[PDB]
Design a protein around this nucleic acid. Structure first.
Ligand SMILES: OC[C@H]1O[C@@](CO)(O[C@H]2O[C@H](CO)[C@@H](O)[C@H](O)[C@H]2O)[C@@H](O)[C@@H]1O
Ligand SMILES: OC[C@H]1O[C@@](CO)(O[C@H]2O[C@H](CO)[C@@H](O)[C@H](O)[C@H]2O)[C@@H](O)[C@@H]1O
Ligand SMILES: [Mg+2]
Length: 580
DNA sequence: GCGATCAGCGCG
DNA sequence: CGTGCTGATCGC
């Protein structure tokens, strides 16, 4: 039967106890400047549902929300914190976030609502959000009676689940990871998302106009060389033009038809002039649809800022993800796409963009965890790691390392990090397995400590059932015991890769926490805007650059102490593009 | 037609 | 290797 609760018309004192499960419901997936549809509070005095117009206007309730001594347990407190920031209300005292707790216990569960986390502890007296709000075009906020009970049941679940979740985190030695890292980081991400990044829309629009011109020209050139018109963006129609009308060789096949990936086209380029044009068309087309039109779609017209949402509880490695827009994959590798960054500017006049990035943090982390003497010495000498790798695997002096040799050694360092494998490397360097295996073997011959680590971590994953990062993040790998070579191999590569990528994630997250504490102590106006896996982007008055040049790198380099140094490069400029 | 897939490409 | 976003596509 239904759950008992008071559907209050006004805020009372017992609703303001110093310990409670709190629900500040924001149904819109993108919570920026979004509506709060209801509030539920469960504490020692009972269960309560409050209408937002009432609670959020009540001085006492707002004070309670902002009182750090009044502890609240929630699910996705960042969502509520940001929704409240847009209304000028501060949320403090969140001592437990069920979403983050569940995430740390097992990222693989994909916990995205209270019901999912509750199911982990055999608690099912709460419905999944999707069941209550529906989804897609049919998504909608239910009538008060249905809404109120759902919010109360969620608060009730959080109230009941706090202790068991904290107990397991403690057994896993992950309690500090939640309380001292992820929860404090949650508040920092909330400030970052709320601050947003300023966009020079006029510059973006002009770039868009020129791209349209260039696309038109390349588009026509393509129809000319094809002898007809067709939907270039249709892998099916394109496949017909390339492999049937033009008789280009089929080197790669796709489940549905002909593969037209850039990888394939690159090899087909020598056969026909249409290929290079299709490649150029896709490059510009990607820029136009995603980084110009797509970006312009999410810019707030009143402030000209984009407010991303950092998903802190999604990746299996501990990395953050970014959406609406995704600001972690803005072009940089190719100059034409890199120009897109000229569109991201400081939010205030006479302010500048400051970007700091870790130099090879993953390989440094690997040197530390594997305790490989050669790799540690390489970083202690701050050597060019790819040139050094080439020197060792190809057995030549530094001056004997050719450009192609370094390129291949670089690709090997790529593979060693993401889980070295014949297929992966071979196909990546466009070579054979017999050859790729030879490189790998040569690499392990030069870095025996890394080989030992790879063997040991795999064995450890099979024994314990999971692998861990420097700060105790965990990833379960049940497929590590699969009798299917492919499935088992993937699991083994994750056993190898996760402690590396995951520890690098732990480090930069701590750096963000340490950095914000330093910025505040120094009372600098500088603030974080974005995190891109191994780099931090800030904006600050031009008068703070010299101080940031010393502070940011130091804080990032000292976040943790490894057997090898951590090195941070940095640049600043009038736009993100110039922060190079 | 709606949402779900597929195929291709951007980043670390 | 992973997330995420795009235009096409197919599924019921
Ligand atoms: O609020 C972020 C937080 O919510 C979850 C669901 O619990 O994701 C929702 O919000 C994201 C940001 O708008 C969307 O990308 C996602 O589709 C939506 O379900 C968590 O995954 C996330 O940590
Ligand atoms: O030849 C041993 C070598 O193979 C790997 C896979 O590259 O693991 C295989 O052999 C182990 C026994 O030594 C099994 O536990 C594992 O399941 C199987 O795939 C390496 O880890 C190992 O060094
Ligand atoms: Mg870097």
């Amino acid at each position: 039967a239904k759950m008992a609760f008071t559907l209050a018309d006004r805020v009372t004192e017992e609703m303001l106890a110093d310990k409670a499960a709190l629900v500040v419901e924001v149904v819109e997936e993108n919570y920026h400047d979004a509506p709060i549809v209801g509030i539920a509070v469960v504490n020692e005095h009972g269960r309560f549902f409050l209408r937002p117009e009432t609670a959020l206007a009540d001085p006492q309730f707002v004070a309670w929300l902002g009182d750090e001594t009044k502890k609240k347990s929630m699910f996705d407190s960042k969502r509520a914190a940001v929704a409240l920031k847009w209304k000028g209300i501060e949320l403090c005292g969140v001592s437990f976030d069920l979403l983050l707790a569940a995430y740390l216990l097992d990222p693989a569960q994909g916990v995205d609502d209270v019901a999912a986390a509750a199911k982990m502890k055999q608690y099912e007296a709460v419905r999944p959000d999707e069941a209550v709000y529906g989804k897609g075009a049919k998504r909608a906020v239910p009538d008060e009676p249905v809404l109120a009970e759902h919010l109360v049941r969620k608060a009730a679940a959080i109230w009941e689940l706090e202790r068991p979740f904290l107990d397991e985190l403690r057994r896993n030695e992950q309690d500090r990871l939640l309380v001292e890292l992820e929860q404090p980081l949650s508040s920092i991400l909330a400030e970052m998302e709320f601050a947003g990044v300023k966009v020079d829309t006029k510059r973006l629009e002009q770039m868009g106009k020129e791209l349209a011109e260039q696309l038109g020209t390349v588009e026509q050139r393509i129809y000319e060389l094809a002898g007809q018109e067709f939907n270039i963006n249709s892998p099916k129609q394109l496949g017909v033009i390339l492999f049937e009308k033009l008789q280009l060789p089929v080197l790669k096949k796709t489940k549905t038809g002909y593969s037209t990936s850039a990888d394939v086209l690159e090899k087909l380029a020598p056969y026909h002039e249409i290929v290079e044009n299709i490649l150029h068309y896709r490059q510009l087309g990607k820029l136009q649809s995603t980084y110009i039109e797509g970006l312009l779609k999410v810019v707030r017209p009143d402030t000209k800022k984009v407010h991303t949402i950092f998903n802190q509880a999604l990746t299996q490695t501990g990395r953050l993800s970014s959406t609406e827009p995704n600001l972690q994959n803005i072009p940089i590798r190719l100059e034409e796409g890199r120009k897109i960054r000229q569109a991201f500017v400081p939010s205030e006049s006479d302010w500048l963009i400051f970007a700091a990035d870790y130099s090879q943090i993953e390989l440094r982390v690997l040197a530390h965890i594997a305790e490989d003497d050669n790799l540690m010495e390489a970083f202690r000498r701050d050597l060019d790691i790819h040139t050094k790798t080439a020197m060792d695997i190809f057995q030549v002096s530094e001056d004997e390392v050719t450009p192609n040799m370094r390129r291949q050694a670089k690709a090997v360092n790529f593979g060693i990090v993401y889980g070295i494998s014949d297929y992966g490397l071979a196909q990546n360097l466009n070579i054979s397995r017999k050859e790729a295996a030879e490189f790998i073997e040569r690499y392990f011959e030069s870095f025996p400590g890394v080989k030992r680590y790879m063997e040991n971590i795999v064995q450890e994953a099979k024994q314990k059932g999971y692998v861990t990062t420097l700060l105790h993040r965990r990833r379960y790998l049940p497929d590590i015991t699969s009798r299917n070579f492919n499935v088992r191999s993937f699991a083994e590569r994750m056993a190898m890769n996760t402690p590396i990528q995951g520890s690098a994630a732990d480090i930069i997250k701590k750096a963000m926490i340490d950095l914000n504490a330093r910025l505040k102590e120094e009372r600098l106006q500088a603030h974080l805007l974005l995190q891109v896996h191994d780099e931090l982007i800030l904006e600050a008055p031009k008068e703070e650059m010299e101080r940031l040049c010393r502070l940011v790198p130091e804080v990032m380099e000292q976040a943790v102490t490894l057997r090898v140094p951590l090195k941070v490069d940095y640049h600043y400029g009038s736009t993100w593009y110039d922060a190079k």
